[PDB]
Amino acid sequence: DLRLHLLLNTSVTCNDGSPAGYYLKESRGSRRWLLFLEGGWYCFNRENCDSRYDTMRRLMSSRDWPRTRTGTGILSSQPEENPYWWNANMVFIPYCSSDVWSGASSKSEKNEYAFMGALIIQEVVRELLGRGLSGAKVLLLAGSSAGGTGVLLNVDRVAEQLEKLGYPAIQVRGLADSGWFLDNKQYRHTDTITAPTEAIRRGIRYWNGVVPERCRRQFQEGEEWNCFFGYKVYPTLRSPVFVVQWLFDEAQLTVDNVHLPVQEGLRLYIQNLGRELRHTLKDVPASFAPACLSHEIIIRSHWTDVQVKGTSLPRALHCWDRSLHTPLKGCPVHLVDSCPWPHCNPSCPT
């Protein structure tokens, strides 16, 4: 089990001003550290955040968090469940800032909520350095869904923080799961429920959201929403990043207004979505993109079962490690399906 630690700097807070925190399991015979960012949508105005506080409060507050959590999937310490990194030091960082891990604003006389996702990551890293992270050789920043986009927004900031603090030997890398979205034309179009790009644009202003500096300089003021889309922010990053994304991701289809007898118009829409996603990954050398309709993530216990071209995700991640010690015989790292319909890969989740 991973044990809860609330942040010693209690000014770094969840939405309601309670302290943020992290869950930790140490592995004293290991110099590898895995820091995982939880997901769970976001909120972008007072009324929408007030609703989230009533029925999704664990994503806005630490008041009700449990003392322990069990590590699963890539966070498991059992080699049978986690062939990749079972002996690593494991860290799970709860998502309680509702800002896609981008915020840097405190609760004040003008702000009903605090949005501190970017500062939470920095404070966790700072406090772990006194608990053994100072001895690491690799820090893998991973995350799923909103946490996967959070990896893209924050991995280079962690690298810069460790360099400025005096630890240039720690190699910082990223693993972004299910956070690589397209700002595409929707299948049907039209408050909250009526487009993601406009909700993110309003969110950034509400949260005082921050994006990586090279991407910010490309798109400039007012246009920072572009950096929340993987295919636009990825080329600006310097740390190595491995991208995991279903070709027919369920969250992508939901915001495209698709809810699964499929007739011709919808058939062509779904096929075009898969081809566009595959196209965005052509110049991403470390990636895993199966032709499945799914919302499942890499902290699930059966994450080892899916394969692309006969290679599982734990294997591809192992080959990525070897590559960062020119392709490797029988040890591939770029794995993108080419078949054009959900479940054309027989290994897709049931």
Ligand X SMILES: CC(=O)NCCc1c[nH]c2ccc(F)cc12
Ligand Y SMILES: *[C@@H]1O[C@H](CO)[C@@H](O)[C@H](O)[C@H]1NC(C)=O
Which residues contribute to the site for ligand X (CB under 6 A)? 41-42, 100, 146, 149, 179, 181, 183-186, 195-197, 200, 228-229, 251-252, 255
User: Residue 100 touches which of ligand X, ligand Y, none (CB < 5 to 8 A by kind)?
Assistant: ligand X
User: Residue 16 touches which of ligand Y, ligand X, none (CB < 5 to 8 A by kind)?
Assistant: none
- Residue tagged active-site, from 249, 256, 287, 294: 249
How far apart are CB 124 and ligand Y at their closest, in Å? 12
> Is 145 known to be catalytic?
yes
Residue nearest ligand Y, CB atom distance: 9
Interface residues with ligand Y (CB under 6 A) are 9, 11-12, 119
Distance CA 156, CA 204 (A): 19
- Residue tagged active-site, from 62, 97, 145, 294: 145
How far apart are CB 13 and ligand Y at their closest, in Å? 10
Using CA atoms, how far residue 9 sits from 35, 78, 95, 130, 244, in Å, is: 19, 33, 17, 14, 33
For tokens 């772990």, the residue is 128
Burial of 67 from C-beta contacts in 10 A (0-12 / 13-18 / 19+): exposed
Distance CA 259, CA 251 (A): 11
Residues 106, 58, 293, 144: what is their CA dihedral angle, to the nearest 10 degrees? Answer: 50
Residue whose CB is less far from ligand X, 170 or 273: 273
For 54, residues 6+ apart whose C-beta sits below 8 A from its C-beta are none
How far apart are CB 19 and ligand Y at their closest, in Å? 11
Complete DSSP assignment for 229-260 = SHHHHGGG--S-EEEE--TEEHHHHHHTT---
How far apart are CB 150 and ligand X at their closest, in Å? 8
How open is the CA angle 320-281-243, to the nearest 5 degrees? 45
Using CA atoms, how far residue 98 sits from 157, 168, 239, 291, in Å, is: 19, 31, 25, 29
Q: Side chain identity at 150, as an amino acid letter?
A: G
> Is 249 known to be catalytic?
yes
User: Residue 143 touches which of ligand X, ligand Y, none (CB < 5 to 8 A by kind)?
Assistant: none
Q: How far is CA 157 from the centre of its chain?
A: 15
Residue whose CB is less far from ligand X, 129 or 199: 199
> Is 1 known to be catalytic?
no
For 130, residues 6+ apart whose C-beta sits below 8 A from its C-beta are none
Residue whose CB is less far from ligand X, 45 or 186: 186
User: Residue 303 touches which of ligand Y, ligand X, none (CB < 5 to 8 A by kind)?
Assistant: none
How far apart are CB 116 and ligand Y at their closest, in Å? 8
Residue nearest ligand X, CB atom distance: 196
Residue whose CB is less far from ligand X, 88 or 121: 121
**Nearest to residue 90, comparing CAs of 1, 152, 168?**
1
- Residue tagged active-site, from 16, 239, 295, 321: 295
Residue whose CB is less far from ligand Y, 16 or 250: 16
How far apart are CB 184 and ligand X at their closest, in Å? 5
User: Residue 12 touches which of ligand X, ligand Y, none (CB < 5 to 8 A by kind)?
Assistant: ligand Y
Distance CA 348, CA 248 (A): 11
User: Residue 9 touches which of ligand X, ligand Y, none (CB < 5 to 8 A by kind)?
Assistant: ligand Y
Residue whose CB is less far from ligand X, 128 or 175: 175
Distance CA 345, CA 341 (A): 9
Q: Catalytic positions, please?
A: 145, 249, 295
